[PDB]
């Protein structure tokens, strides 16, 4: 199954996000992340990534395509925006070996109130 999430400056949702910051997937999924606005890209939370799972940083403005396999989450944040919380949330699976990880990670405060709002969606 594929899917999509928009980089965007002023959503819905705040400004600097991920939309929908959250998504559920299945192993062998595709994940496009679609540049709606410029100034935006996706890299992998270090600390919230699945055993095996190589780290990620796309180039701004520009599409990425993220592949997911490893069950497990995979926090992802745009790297010029972390600090004003642009953060996203991938689910492959159900119950995530690295929930916790995910619960106490670093991150600038904007970035954990939007990280805790996505693994609220945890299935
Ligand atoms: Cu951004």
Do not use: W
């Not at 400056?9 to 595709?30: H, L």
């Not at 944040?77 to 159900?94: A, S, W, Y």
């Amino acid at each position: 199954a594929t899917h999509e999430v928009h980089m965007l400056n002023k959503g819905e949702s705040g400004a600097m996000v991920f939309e929908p910051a959250f998504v559920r997937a299945e192993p062998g999924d595709v994940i496009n992340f679609v540049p709606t606005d410029k100034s935006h890209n996706v890299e992998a939370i270090k600390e919230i990534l699945p055993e095996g799972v190589e780290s990620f940083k796309s180039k701004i403005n520009e599409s990425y395509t993220l592949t997911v396999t490893e069950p497990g989450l995979y926090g992802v944040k745009c790297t010029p925006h972390f600090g004003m919380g642009m953060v996203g949330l991938v689910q492959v699976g159900d119950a995530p070996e690295n929930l916790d990880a995910a619960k106490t990670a670093k991150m600038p405060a904007k970035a954990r109130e939007r990280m805790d709002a996505e693994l609220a969606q945890v299935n």
